Amino acid sequence: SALTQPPSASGSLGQSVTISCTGTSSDVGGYNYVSWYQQHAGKAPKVIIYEVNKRPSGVPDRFSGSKSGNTASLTVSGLQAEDEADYYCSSYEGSDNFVFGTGTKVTVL
Ligand SMILES: O=C(O)c1cc(/N=N/c2ccc(S(=O)(=O)Nc3ccccn3)cc2)ccc1O
């Protein structure tokens, strides 16, 4: 029981990176309650997106979410050096329960 994410992804500075988060019709595909977290090495996780494509305050406009079917995604557009980090998704999966993805390490070329 984990959501599927690519282990790693790279992009050039100023370009975009997209990270997918694939589950099933019982979680990612069944609800609009996908969240994304950014974690720099040895630091606490930052909430970047909730409810598929809502941003907390302080998250730049260049981070966005989308979802189609059983796959949600996070795009980091206008890639900056500080965007190098591990990124995790999560979903609601029914009955007051949540499930996390396995994480993607994003590097800048
Ligand atoms: O500042 C904020 O906006 C802020 C927002 C935060 N959002 N946290 C989350 C984390 C996950 C979700 S979610 O995509 O799972 N959505 C939901 C929605 C309703 C019930 C359960 N889950 C929803 C909100 C958490 C802390 C904060 O400070």
Residue numbers in the entry: 2 to 110
From the study:
Our work focuses on a λ patient-derived VL homo-dimer named Mcg whose structure and properties were detailed in pioneering studies by Edmundson and coworkers. The cavity between the two VL domains in Mcg is capable of binding a wide array of ligands, including synthetic organic molecules and peptides, which form contacts with the side chains of the dimer cavity. VLs exist in equilibrium between homo-dimers and amyloid-prone monomers. Likewise, mutations that stabilize the structure of VLs or covalently fix VL dimers inhibit formation of amyloid fibrils. These results indicate that formation of amyloid fibrils involves two steps: VL dimer disassociation into monomers followed by partial or full unfolding.
Of these 13 molecules from DrugBank, only sulfasalazine showed an inhibitory effect on formation of amyloid fibrils. Crystals of the complex belong to space group P21212 with two symmetry-related ligands bound per Mcg dimer, and thus one ligand bound per VL in the asymmetric unit. The crystal structure shows that each of the sulfasalazine ligands occupy all three A-B-C-sites simultaneously; each ligand binds to the A and B-sites on one of the VLs composing the dimer, while C-site binding is on the symmetry-related VL. This contrasts with methylene blue, which is bound only to the A-site. The crystal structure of Mcg with sulfasalazine explains why only one disassociation constant for specific binding was measured. Therefore, the equivalence of the two sulfasalazine ligands in the crystal explains why only one disassociation constant was measured by means of equilibrium dialysis. Scatchard plots for sulfasalazine show that the two specific binding sites on Mcg are identical with the same disassociation constant and that this specific ligand binding is followed by non-specific binding. In the case of sulfasalazine, to confirm binding specifically to soluble dimers, the analytical ultracentrifugation experiments identified dimers as the only quaternary state of the ligand-bound complex. The ligand concentration that effectively inhibited amyloid formation in these assays was 500 μM for methylene blue and 250 μM for sulfasalazine.
